[PDB]
Amino acid sequence: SSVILTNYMDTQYYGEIGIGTPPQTFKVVFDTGSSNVWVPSSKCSRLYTACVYHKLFDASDSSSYKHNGTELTLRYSTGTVSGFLSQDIITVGGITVTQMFGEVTEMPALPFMLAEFDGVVGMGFIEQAIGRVTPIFDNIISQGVLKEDVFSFYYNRDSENSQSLGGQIVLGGSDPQHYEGNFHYINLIKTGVWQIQMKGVSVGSSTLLCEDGCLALVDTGASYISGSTSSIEKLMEALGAKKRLFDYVVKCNEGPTLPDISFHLGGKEYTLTSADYVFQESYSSKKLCTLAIHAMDIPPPTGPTWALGATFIRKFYTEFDRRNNRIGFALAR
Numbered sequence: 001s002s003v004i005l006t007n008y009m010d011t012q013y014y015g016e017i018g019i020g021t022p023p024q025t026f027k028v029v030f031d032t033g034s035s036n037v038w039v040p041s042s043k044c045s046r047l048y049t050a051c052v053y054h055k056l057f058d059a060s061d062s063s064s065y066k067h068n069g070t071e072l073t074l075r076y077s078t079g080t081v082s083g084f085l086s087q088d089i090i091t092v093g094g095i096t097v098t099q100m101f102g103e104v105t106e107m108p109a110l111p112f113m114l115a116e117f118d119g120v121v122g123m124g125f126i127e128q129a130i131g132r133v134t135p136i137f138d139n140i141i142s143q144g145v146l147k148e149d150v151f152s153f154y155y156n157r158d159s160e161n162s163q164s165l166g167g168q169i170v171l172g173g174s175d176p177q178h179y180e181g182n183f184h185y186i187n188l189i190k191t192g193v194w195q196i197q198m199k200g201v202s203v204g205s206s207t208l209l210c211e212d213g214c215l216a217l218v219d220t221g222a223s224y225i226s227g228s229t230s231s232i233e234k235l236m237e238a239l240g241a242k243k244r245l246f247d248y249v250v251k252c253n254e255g256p257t258l259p260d261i262s263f264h265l266g267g268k269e270y271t272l273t274s275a276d277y278v279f280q281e282s283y284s285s286k287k288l289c290t291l292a293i294h295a296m297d298i299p300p301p302t303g304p305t306w307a308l309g310a311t312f313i314r315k316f317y318t319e320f321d322r323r324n325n326r327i328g329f330a331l332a333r
Ligand SMILES: CCc1nc(N)nc(NCCc2ccccc2)c1-c1ccc2c(c1)N(CCCOC)CCC2
Pocket: 011, 012, 013, 029, 031, 032, 033, 034, 076, 077, 078, 079, 111, 112, 114, 115, 116, 120, 219, 220, 221, 222, 223, 224, 294, 296, 310
């Protein structure tokens, strides 16, 4: 099965799912960086303006709803949501599965008012599931219908004309229509986390970063490519970028000349051009241009670690192999 994704400003990729009977529709981000499922609850106080601006799940309108009530709190590096667990039938591109999900009742203005999606569908391992809830992919596999224990992501470059698919997730395999050459794999350090070993990071002609090695979390739920404050400060200085409150910037006119940045994964250099990592929205020297690379300190056990989000997946079609506990990259097309 495949799910069509919408690309919002190159920073948010989401698709649709259906919950309950009759189906209640929701926009959600398929996130390899988390393992739980959640959507806003009709029980979310309207005092949370974020709940006033999103689709809310009303249990009392679903004849397939199954109460639970256990509380849970999901924490992402940029925000937190809280609520309780509920069960109901979820639709994901043709596939129908009974699933346990979080009904959020506390959804902070910052950052969820800036969220185009309503909720999230974790594609991570059960080892990372808050409340030990079975992840939706695990449940789908238990039906022995998928041809393979894998799923793939394609994130298209933002488009200005509503006629190009924003992105696509394939449950069961990959789609040769969106990648060329063949895959190249790197094995997961440990099962339970979509994190792999990264041999090094280079900016231009000098492997100045992540020498000796470092970790890389492959996060489909992350807008950018991120590293530890230390690492980024070092990377950014080599680019001549000035730090701000939430990002790094360069004079727009300097963007096109910025050097390449390479990530050494499993004996294969993955290279990005400045066009790949800077939001070139002008060529003026009198204006600042943001970079799609941020600093983000991720705490143990997962971190410290780099994160390969949307900025990296736009360029490289990604396959998440569960059966073999490896990740595969190929040139996006
Ligand atoms: C999909 C949920 C999610 N999962 C994971 N693993 N990390 C997140 N941020 C931690 C990583 C991160 C760092 C810096 C900026 C954005 C995300 C977020 C998360 C949380 C809040 C918001 C997000 C993303 N977005 C971006 C959606 C991404 O779609 C592909 C915009 C609205 C507010």
